[model samples]
Target: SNAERLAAWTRLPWEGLRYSYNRERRGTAARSCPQLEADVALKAETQPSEIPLERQLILEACREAERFGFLHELSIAIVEMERLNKRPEAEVEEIAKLW
Candidate 1:
């Protein structure tokens, strides 16, 4: 089993996106985005008893970036497929048909 390879493949692009997001978001007002309200709780929970608070903050930042990368990719795929099938006005109708 090539678990390491699979992990590398999955994480590399997402990590890149994470770095890209951090470049834009780190130390900025965007850090206060209400969307991160839950991230606060998750970050706290992810902390290991032995890990330092500094490390916890770093881990949380990475986790946030990974999530952003995945969501961005998923959203792009959905939008691209929808646009390929129909126009913006038709999106509502097309989506409803799938329901």
Candidate 2:
């Protein structure tokens, strides 16, 4: 199959939006987003051996973006990931409290 061609098609336009001036109006505090393929592949990779898990959250996020005519889901996922980037102890404590 033409997987490489399909990948390029999916990746290029979102890369364009990441550099677009349309984002300028979103203001100074708007978060930087990840490259969808690279970031997702990394996220889906299992540690130690680094095997990729293809059909995970990032794939769903990309599908959502295509369905909605935008790449905001990828950006939002980046924001959400960064929001939980550190402090595993605090996150676990909060999760425990929520239960």
Candidate 3:
């Protein structure tokens, strides 16, 4: 379900969050808003009732860059690895650990 959520999250662009992706685990957030505001905007954009989508408030994992942030980054790495075939499984796991 995380893969599905990540798929949906990436496909949907939140102009309100003012985020633009780097196609990796991170993105650029413009200065007009804080993480709280961005999280709110992300929720607003993913409403299945409001549109044709639903997803976890995944950024909730990133507010603390201590480690939970890697919760999403690992997902990003796996997806990129599978899609791009850039690395082997063991290597992907090893490299993603450092990301």
Q: Which sequence of candidate numbers ranks them by TM-score, best first?
A: 1, 2, 3
Tens-place lDDT digits, model 1, residues 1-99: 122222222322332333433454544444432344456556667764765443343344445544444323323333344455554655435333332
| lDDT for each residue of candidate 2 in 1-99, tens digit (9 for 90 to 100) | 122222222322343434431343243332234444555556566443443333332344444344444444334433333345442555434433322
Q: How many clashes in each candidate?
A: 0, 0, 0
- CA lDDT, candidate 3, residue 47: 61
- Residue pairs of candidate 3 with colliding backbone atoms: none
> Model 3: per-residue lDDT, tens digit, 17-92?
1232223335434222355456656677666355432233334322322232333654564346444644456654
Model 3 ranges off by over 4 Å = 1-83
Off by over 4 Å in 1: 1-23, 26-48, 70-99
lDDT (Cα atoms) of all candidates against the true structure: 0.40, 0.38, 0.39
State the TM-score for model 1.
Answer: 0.28
TM-score on alpha carbons, each prediction: 0.28, 0.24, 0.22
